[PDB]
Design a protein around this ligand. Structure first.
Ligand SMILES: Cc1cc2c(cc1C)N(C[C@H](O)[C@H](O)[C@H](O)COP(=O)(O)OP(=O)(O)OC[C@H]1O[C@@H](n3cnc4c(N)ncnc43)[C@H](O)[C@@H]1O)c1[nH]c(=O)[nH]c(=O)c1N2
Ligand SMILES: NC(=O)c1ccc[n+]([C@@H]2O[C@H](COP(=O)([O-])OP(=O)(O)OC[C@H]3O[C@@H](n4cnc5c(N)ncnc54)[C@H](O)[C@@H]3O)[C@@H](O)[C@H]2O)c1
Length: 432
């Protein structure tokens, strides 16, 4: 049994950014521990679907350890031990008892805390959840952690020059199809929805990327579903069978069909809301001294007066700082302001790069140049509900053009005329 005043459960992005805030708040040696099932100190997870997979000049640890992804300093394992912050790596907690403040690992080790910070992130939904035949064949890969990224880098070198199938049309589907393409793979994207990124992209935004990906040689099969996989004698995947009977040849298969908050250790012990652990504006759960941050928390999104859950890296960084300030603030009888978050999402693929700020509610208006064969495409979209701008998307924008649409999403300016908004386009944001 090891006791610590503060225990961060998980060693991902929120854990690393909470550790940075703890050091900034004068944490003392022996006070804080980070328990992680990963063998490495916290890192900027977004690099795993991008830089990590490049055929040349690839991103490797320790380069992308936190907090460099936000322009902060690198926190190598020594950053922690110099401060008396115990990193407990390769340790998976299989039981958590909030009533006795005890965490129990797979090997039966126990750890106690005074303050717990749940930062377990998201699970990887696997094709077994839909009873897909052959989903256990070798080379049917998923991407969540650095070990998955290493197994993917190796399968890429092994099957290079061959055929890849990507099941999923979300973030992983779009980013991984691009990764396999640049790695000399013949890629097919498969997903059941009528267009890519259905939870964010309109049919018009999606159509730009479908045409773009097609010209790069990526076959995008909309309205398609994988129902099985063929495998050879060694058990390696050889093909992907679709609901319509079409069979695609596959040397490697990559799947991105969503993630769920990794809350399994606390079911029945914390209040929940839409899959996540329900928190207040300071990330404290229904149990005093227990906080939940990043991907697992369903917190009040102040701007929209609703409880929301965000499974993106910007929120994992901002929520971590909020919970640590809330814990340290209470120790001095002080209160900190409520979390005031502006949902910020982004994706990168090929020579493209988009940003989204706010909420994708109401009706949309496409602006700019959305031609996929243009050398420098720049186009965006606005989301309008109740006469005001709620959301703003922009592909190919400059730093100041991205901050202009972010300003629009924060301030929710009124739209007296949609005809004028369509006519101004990106200038509506740049002016305001
Ligand atoms: C490959 C890939 C690529 C991207 C992204 C995700 C993925 C999977 N994201 C999403 C973003 O990385 C994500 O929102 C943050 O990692 C969330 O930070 P957390 O700390 O909440 O979870 P995160 O998953 O980072 O950390 C959870 C940690 O808890 C550990 N853990 C869980 N259960 C445990 C247990 N029982 N015992 C011990 N340890 C345990 C995990 O092993 C991990 O170390 C993204 N977002 C974005 O906006 N832009 C981007 O470009 C990307 N790119
Ligand atoms: N740039 C980024 O923001 C980025 C990049 C990579 C990963 N991520 C994060 O990592 C996590 C995993 O991403 P993801 O792409 O797996 O999730 P996702 O939620 O973005 O997309 C999964 C998509 O696959 C669809 N799908 C579900 N079942 C399917 C099936 N049987 N066949 C095909 N498609 C199916 C879903 O409806 C959804 O559209 C998420 O939390 C995501 O936000 C984010």
């Amino acid at each position: 049994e090891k006791h610590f005043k503060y225990v961060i459960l998980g060693g991902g992005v929120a854990a690393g950014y909470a550790a940075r805030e703890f050091a900034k708040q004068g944490v003392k040696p022996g006070e804080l521990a980070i328990i992680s099932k990963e063998a490495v100190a916290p890192y900027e997870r977004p690099a795993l679907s991008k830089g990590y997979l490049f055929p040349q000049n690839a991103a490797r640890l320790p380069g992308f350890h936190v907090c460099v992804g936000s322009g902060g300093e690198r926190q190598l394992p020594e950053w922690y031990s110099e401060k008396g912050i115990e990193l407990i790596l390769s340790t998976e907690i299989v039981k958590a008892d909030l009533s006795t403040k005890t965490l129990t690992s797979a090997a039966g080790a126990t750890f106690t805390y005074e303050i717990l910070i749940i930062a377990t992130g998201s699970s990887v939904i696997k094709l077994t959840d839909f009873g897909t035949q052959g989903a256990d064949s070798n080379n049917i890969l998923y991407l969540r952690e650095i070990d998955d990224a290493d197994k993917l880098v190796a399968a890429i070198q092994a099957k290079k020059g061959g055929k890849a199938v990507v099941v999923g049309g979300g973030y992983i589907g779009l980013e991984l199809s691009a990764a396999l393409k640049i790695n000399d793979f013949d890629v097919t994207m498969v997903f059941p929805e009528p267009w890519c990124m259905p939870r964010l992209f309109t049919a018009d935004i999606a159509a730009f990327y479908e045409a773009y990906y097609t010209n790069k040689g990526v076959k995008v099969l909309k309205g398609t579903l994988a129902v099985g996989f063929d495998a050879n004698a060694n058990g390696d995947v050889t093909a992907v069978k679709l609901k319509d009977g079409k069979v695609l040849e596959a040397d490697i298969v990559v799947v991105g069909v969503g993630g769920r908050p990794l809350t399994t250790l606390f079911k029945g012990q914390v209040a929940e809301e839409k899959g996540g652990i329900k928190t207040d504006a300071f990330f404290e759960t229904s149990v005093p001294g227990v906080y939940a941050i990043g991907d697992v928390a369903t917190f009040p999104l102040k701007m929209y007066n609703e409880l929301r859950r965000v499974e993106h890296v910007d929120h994992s960084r901002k929520s971590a700082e909020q919970a640590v300030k809330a814990i340290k603030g209470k120790e001095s009888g002080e209160s900190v302001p409520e979390y005031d978050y502006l949902p910020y999402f982004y994706s990168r693929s090929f020579d493209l790069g988009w940003q989204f700020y706010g909420d994708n509610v109401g009706e949309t208006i496409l602006f700019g140049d959305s031609d996929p064969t243009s050398s420098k495409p720049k186009f965006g979209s606005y989301w309008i509900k109740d006469g005001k701008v709620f959301g703003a998307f922009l592909e190919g924008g400059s730093p100041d053009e991205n901050n202009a649409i972010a300003k629009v999403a924060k301030t929710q300016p009124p739209v007296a005329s949609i005809e004028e908004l369509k006519k101004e386009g990106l200038q509506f944001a740049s002016k305001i």
